[PDB]
Ligand binder design. Sequence first.
Ligand SMILES: *[C@@H]1O[C@H](CO)[C@@H](O[C@@H]2O[C@H](CO)[C@@H](O)[C@H](O)[C@H]2NC(C)=O)[C@H](O)[C@H]1NC(C)=O
Ligand SMILES: *[C@@H]1O[C@H](CO)[C@@H](O[C@@H]2O[C@H](CO)[C@@H](O)[C@H](O)[C@H]2NC(C)=O)[C@H](O)[C@H]1NC(C)=O
Ligand SMILES: CC(=O)N[C@H]1C(=O)O[C@H](CO)[C@@H](O)[C@@H]1O
Ligand SMILES: CC(=O)N[C@H]1C(=O)O[C@H](CO)[C@@H](O)[C@@H]1O
Ligand SMILES: *[C@@H]1O[C@H](CO)[C@@H](O)[C@H](O)[C@H]1NC(C)=O
Ligand SMILES: *[C@@H]1O[C@H](CO)[C@@H](O)[C@H](O)[C@H]1NC(C)=O
Lengths: 483, 483
Amino acid sequence: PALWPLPLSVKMTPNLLHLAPENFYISHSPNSTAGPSCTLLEEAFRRYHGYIFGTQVQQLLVSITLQSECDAFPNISSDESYTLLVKEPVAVLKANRVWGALRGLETFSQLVYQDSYGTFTINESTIIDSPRFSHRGILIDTSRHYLPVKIILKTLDAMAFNKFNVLHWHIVDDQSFPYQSITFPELSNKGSYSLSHVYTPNDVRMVIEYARLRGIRVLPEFDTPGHTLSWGKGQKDLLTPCYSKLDSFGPINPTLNTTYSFLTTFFKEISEVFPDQFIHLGGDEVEFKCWESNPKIQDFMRQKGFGTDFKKLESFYIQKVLDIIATINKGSIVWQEVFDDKAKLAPGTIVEVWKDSAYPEELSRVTASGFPVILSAPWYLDLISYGQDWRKYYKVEPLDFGGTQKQKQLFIGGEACLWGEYVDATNLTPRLWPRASAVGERLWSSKDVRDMDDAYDRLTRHRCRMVERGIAAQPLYAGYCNH
Amino acid sequence: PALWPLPLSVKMTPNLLHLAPENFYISHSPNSTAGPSCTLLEEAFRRYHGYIFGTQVQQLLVSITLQSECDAFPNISSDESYTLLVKEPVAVLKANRVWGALRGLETFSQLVYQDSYGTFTINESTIIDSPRFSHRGILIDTSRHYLPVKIILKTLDAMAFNKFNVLHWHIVDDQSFPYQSITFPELSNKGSYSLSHVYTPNDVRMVIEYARLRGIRVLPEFDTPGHTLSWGKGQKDLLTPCYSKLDSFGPINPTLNTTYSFLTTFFKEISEVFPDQFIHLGGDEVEFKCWESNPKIQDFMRQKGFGTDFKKLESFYIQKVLDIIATINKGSIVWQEVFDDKAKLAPGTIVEVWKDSAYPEELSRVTASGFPVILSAPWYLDLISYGQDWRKYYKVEPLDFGGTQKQKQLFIGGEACLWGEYVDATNLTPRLWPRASAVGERLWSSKDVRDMDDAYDRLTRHRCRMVERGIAAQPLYAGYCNH
Ligand SMILES: *[C@@H]1O[C@H](CO)[C@@H](O[C@@H]2O[C@H](CO)[C@@H](O)[C@H](O)[C@H]2NC(C)=O)[C@H](O)[C@H]1NC(C)=O
Ligand SMILES: *[C@@H]1O[C@H](CO)[C@@H](O[C@@H]2O[C@H](CO)[C@@H](O)[C@H](O)[C@H]2NC(C)=O)[C@H](O)[C@H]1NC(C)=O
Ligand SMILES: CC(=O)N[C@H]1C(=O)O[C@H](CO)[C@@H](O)[C@@H]1O
Ligand SMILES: CC(=O)N[C@H]1C(=O)O[C@H](CO)[C@@H](O)[C@@H]1O
Ligand SMILES: *[C@@H]1O[C@H](CO)[C@@H](O)[C@H](O)[C@H]1NC(C)=O
Ligand SMILES: *[C@@H]1O[C@H](CO)[C@@H](O)[C@H](O)[C@H]1NC(C)=O
């Protein structure tokens, strides 16, 4: 009886219906673009029947209206709207695509409950729902700490329970390179913490398909030019050597052709491994020091007439990378610095705003320039604090920044980020849930859903539900669960 | 060979000795006051054999010098010192009491490591060790959230790995009364979150014996007169009705004869259930408004000539409870307010300093008045923050306050506290370890052990060892463990 996220339009009635575990079917409506050949739906039907059961409404008929997209990979443009008509003798779930059906199945399971005598019950009701924003993501960091594939899958399960639809996989960084590249086997061979802390091509396909079956996009992030210390272990001459030499290395060297030919071969591979339409190129916190200390780079700066402005060198670099992505049928997402340091961005390039200091203004600037924008700044869940910090994440109102409606339309969503300096398998799940659920509701539910007492009431029970489903979500406050 | 806490004296040699898993015995020296009939040692030998193994030193002989105390419960006066002589063919662990042997076994297990080829190895070495402080505790809160017995047992194991010797069990409080009382069945029947959220007499015995086998004291805290809301559900007319009329209640009513007869009977039961010599009476955050609003109490204040000074009414209450404890062969521990509010305490009453505003001065006052003191103030592990907060707990130097040497001798130790408003079985362990390990080394090791790099280096490996032993201790920073 606790809905989370709260659907767009909910109409409940005090009429009670009952379900019989051994005689309740989730089936395909005779009128549907999907049938038993639709693996995604067939698996969801079985999956949710187990989540639900561990007068009589004897069946839930599922009807997909338009071409189902059952065999496709979800996209930022995917329609996740759906309609739920709970009545006897047959309940009906209707949606334009399989994506909306997935969400509706989750909502339906949250409606079913057991009364005082253990009787499976559901109230007669009508639900009309659709997300406020299209990009609702969780960022995981598998470089600062390697995360076993199983916990990544458990995270995707929790994401589906919360209607998140994007897993921003910040797979590599300075400390380690777990991604196993087939065209460049020395990256992980030499950059991984160990050969037992790597993601084989199969581990990757596994995350991706498991995510697809839940309507979740897997956005890979291969951060450059900064945050690339671990890439140097296996790719010679990629990183920039620093000077008082020094045994220190800086960001990727943007003045070498070998750098671009390597990035060209590497991203062609990424374009073939990750089916998502987008590739996050990163571009955050590039340290200019080593570049400036390097003699050859000083000459390159002279030959290009960049003077002493290294943002131009950064821009030069990012623009060549951006161009490579553009030739491999992929879109690009970058951290705000790429935009702030005046790089020339092609239309459609998504900018992710992560810096907390006056981010509403950064939102105006980005959308003013006409670029799609994603907000993560107020949702750095790795920055833990004492108490109910879920309230501050919940209270955020993303569209509160100066701009026209056309500008506001460039805002496509946000992400709760769980960077890994202090996170691994021992503490990931409770740190992530239910704190991220606050971001989930703010990104899915209408802007007006803001009552804190009601939020607390539904979140408390949704958290217990996550625990009964095997997600070690931490408590909101003193209390207990009846599970 | 990552020792934690760092022993008092460690003399290491580069000579390597090796152990044969199938041919390595931990035995009673023929010269020892303990033998096979000593269950505590027999269980430890077995337990540590499994921890160690998941120029040959064939055996580790254990010699207890004075009366063993094998069948007793540990006490604040217990001698935990020991000596470890690691040499071939027989190593020797010698201690005055079994308590020191327990500590020695842990240290011995930390000296054994597997070399590059999986060979069990240990460096020839000599260790002389004893704790800097006698009271080294962890406070758990099973009221704000019920904790299944298994996580309490699990916590006791981690405490042993870290040389903690006191479990401060804040068993009840405002939100729930999990303790099952035989004399007062309704306290838990009506005050627990549910009947499946209680500690039966058997649950309590289990915690107590499991702790004893590890040289850990179980210190019970039944907080009064404040923090007693749940006690009111099953014991009528115990709590003070507040007025202004009001279906509202405050702390325990100190003016009724029924209160003291009830507490006399209740604490007699506690003195029989918990073998530890001390009972923590609590006494923190007593709100006076409810008392002030009660007519009958106002009368009592008049009859007693207390005027409008309710601290006198508080002192009155706690002094009577303190007297009850004194008549049942137990000592008392109280939160600082009892001392601060000028209650008359008998010699030997221990005062726990928990308020962090100028706690060093509070330490000065308490010891100046001649009372033993325990510090928890700077170690509130429930108050989480971003990053390596383990370092701030580690940097604390407890004896840095004004006082003579005699005053300083009254400081008997401290506790790392993990209050439960935001803690239950889903997040307790990773939140508690290795953060509490910092406090563990400050309370055990000498005052001069303060190098941060060395601490970081040993803690990091100690944390991996904890994970290996089944404790989901969270990471200190980026990295990995050689699983
Ligand atoms: C689902 O239906 C039940 C009715 O069977 C609703 O429960 C009733 O709630 C109202 C007001 O809260 C009470 O007056 C009734 O006593 C309840 N029913 C019973 C058992 O008599 C329940 O509120 C409905 N769900 C929602 C949220 O609409
Ligand atoms: C335990 O013994 C080993 C081996 O004698 C010590 O390690 C040697 O340390 C020296 C100098 O630090 C190195 O040159 C050797 O290469 C090491 N031996 C090995 C493993 O090849 C080790 O220091 C001793 N342990 C302690 C803490 O004293
Ligand atoms: C865009 C981004 O967040 N970059 C870095 C940062 O500034 O903070 C995080 C920790 O909070 C780090 O993990 C990231 O590497
Ligand atoms: C002595 C003591 O700590 N008393 C209260 C407090 O002030 O802080 C804790 C939370 O940090 C609460 O759980 C305790 O009930
Ligand atoms: C399918 O559509 C037809 C025609 O609109 C209608 O008569 C029939 O009742 C529908 N069947 C179901 C199960 O919805
Ligand atoms: C026990 O003590 C005796 C007498 O001091 C000594 O001879 C013997 O070696 C000791 N045994 C062991 C195993 O330490």
